[PDB]
């Protein structure tokens, strides 16, 4: 993405998408493992489908004609040039379109992760805008691990976050 999350991270080497928590116990660059393996499987399937769908038989594309068979030579040249034109145009257009599709795929993965985190933190946290969420309670390492894992219990911190919300 390059929209509401305008900066990539160099300190996260584990996966393509992940988290970053600031806490009283310490900071860190965690990774979202399920999303990055799903993306890796998808990209592997995409590359293998692009490459392995090309099955070619044994052929020799070179022919030799004498000086009284130039119509045949020009017909063979037309065949070769037409095949080259078709393959070149198709390959370039395919690469362009699939690059666009892959970048949109990564953007969708990042946005889906963002909405997945946002759904759990209904109003126990507030969006900052860069891509970040500031809690109204004290999210320790157990709470952060629950948020990244997907089993964040809203009712446990609901009132503690509500009083902080209404304080300001």
């Amino acid at each position, epitope marked *: 993405i390059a929209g509401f999350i305008e900066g990539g991270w160099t300190g996260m080497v584990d996966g393509w998408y992940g988290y970053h928590h600031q806490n009283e116990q310490g900071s860190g660059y965690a990774a979202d493992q399920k999303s*990055t393996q799903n993306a890796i499987n998808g990209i592997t399937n995409k590359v293998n489908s692009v490459i392995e769908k090309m099955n070619t038989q044994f052929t020799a594309v070179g022919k030799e004609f004498n000086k009284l068979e130039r119509r045949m030579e020009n017909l063979n040249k037309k065949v070769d040039d037409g095949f080259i034109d078709i393959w070149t145009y198709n390959a370039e257009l395919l690469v362009l379109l699939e690059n666009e599709r892959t970048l949109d795929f990564h953007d969708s993965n990042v946005k889906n992760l963002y909405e997945k985190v946002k759904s759990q933190l209904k109003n126990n946290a507030k969006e900052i805008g860069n891509g970040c969420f500031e809690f109204y309670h004290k999210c320790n390492d157990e709470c952060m*691990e629950s948020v990244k894992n997907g089993t964040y219990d809203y009712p446990k911190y609901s009132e503690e976050s509500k009083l902080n919300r209404e304080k300001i």
Partner: antibody
Amino acid sequence: QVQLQESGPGLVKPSETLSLTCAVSGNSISSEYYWAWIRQPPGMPPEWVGTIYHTGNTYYNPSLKSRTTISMDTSKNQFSLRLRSVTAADSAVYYCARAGVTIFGLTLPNYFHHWGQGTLVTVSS
Amino acid sequence: IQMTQSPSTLSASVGDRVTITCRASQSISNWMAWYQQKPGKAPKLLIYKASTLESGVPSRFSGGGSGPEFTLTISSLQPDDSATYYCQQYNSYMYTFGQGTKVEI
């Protein structure tokens, strides 16, 4: 092209710290991959102890997290394990391994691809 | 996370097509790893990502499955296959090994 060699005391008295050191050749341990300690008690399955990243990030086994510490030497290729408060249950074979596989320019810590040799630590007196 | 590997012990003659099954408590990964440890030596990874073959590994070893269940298959057994086979999975920041499966001729 990666060679790992462990070294440490084969006999450790109880209730005393336990220091091992793995030295790496053919690779730079402050640059690319992750480096882990794996122990195996006699007649049991292997157990992951901890891992240190090339960025200096350490992740420990939750059961052994309190009394373990993995350190790196950014001068020569060495990483060391300091397992404290050692009981008779710590008598096991210890291994140093390289975790990390590179696909699509991304290095994942999923599996240990190269292993050391294994030093047997016996806790007795 | 709990990992169960079956059968615990196994004997089979040369040429038998053998299969070991590993089951994981949580299916957040489609990937599993297989190690072959011979007595007195360190484990040696054979399969990773639940299907990929490690370099230098004989082709008869293969892996399959997904979700909660994965399988390791040896087609043409060899006399040097007597070892303990382990299934391992890295989930979040934890590596879990499954109990071994001894193989005897």
